[PDB]
Amino acid sequence: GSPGIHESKEWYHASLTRAQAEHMLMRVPRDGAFLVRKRNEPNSYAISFRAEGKIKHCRVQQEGQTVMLGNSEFDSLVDLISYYEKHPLYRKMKLRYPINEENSS
């Protein structure tokens, strides 16, 4: 809510090892979780998430006008996943796993 508009800090990564996220996503069997991280430049972001145990991230693009997460443009980084949070991202993912299998039952 308050913490998310423009400035954000809780799911996006931009300091710790980005590749280390894959080793942390494989330790969670049965569904993984949805996260994000920075790339090798301030002109492109990515989403690190996974299910089962086949870790896979994503690459969101951005232009000088609006951003393009995929089939929708949403210059807002939080609004981009805000509407897609309830809708389906890839052919099945849905950012519905904001935590690792441990106490979400």
């Binding site: 990515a46 896979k56 994503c58 997460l69 995929g70 991202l89 052919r91």
Partner: peptide, 12 residues
Amino acid sequence: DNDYIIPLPDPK
């Protein structure tokens, strides 16, 4: 090409 995917709601 692994460790990356496109957020598209459909098989295409």
